[PDB]
Amino acid sequence: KTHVQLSLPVLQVRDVLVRGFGDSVEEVLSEARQHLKDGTCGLVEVEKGVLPQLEQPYVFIKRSDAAPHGHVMVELVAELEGIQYGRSGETLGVLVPHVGEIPVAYRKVLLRK
């Protein structure tokens, strides 16, 4: 399937134990895709002061379209030192590994895989 319905646990930035997916744009996109498939991927909603508390490169989910079954269609865009690898719509949040942190909410998405 080109798209997969996922329910992503929304984590508070100060709860996150593993604050990024790796050390290169290509690695963080790879790892993010693996964690999304394995159901071990959390989402942090971006606000003032959130991104400096996470590790670069960042992986964003961005709205790719204007929402089947409540699931917003999203794709992955990485960012390293102010350069993004990908072009998409509005940021829904930054992806991080989920290692058992208690979420505050769930974000239903349709991931272009």
UniProtKB/Swiss-Prot annotation:
Changing residue 37 to R: reported impact? In strain: Omicron/XBB.1.5, Omicron/EG.5.1
Q: List where in the cell it is found.
A: Host cytoplasm
Signal peptide interval: none
Q: Where is this region: Disordered?
A: 1-113
Domain named CoV Nsp1 globular is located at: 2-113
Q: Name the source's superkingdom.
A: Viruses
What does this gene product do? Inhibits host translation by associating with the open head conformation of the 40S subunit. The C-terminus binds to and obstructs ribosomal mRNA entry tunnel. Thereby inhibits antiviral response triggered by innate immunity or interferons. The nsp1-40S ribosome complex further induces an endonucleolytic cleavage near the 5'UTR of host mRNAs, targeting them for degradation. This inhibits the integrated stress response (ISR) in the infected cell by preventing EIF2S1/eIF2-alpha phosphorylation upstream of stress granule formation and depletes host G3BP1.
Protein known as: Host translation inhibitor nsp1
User: Which residues of the complete protein appear here?
Assistant: 11 to 125 of 7096
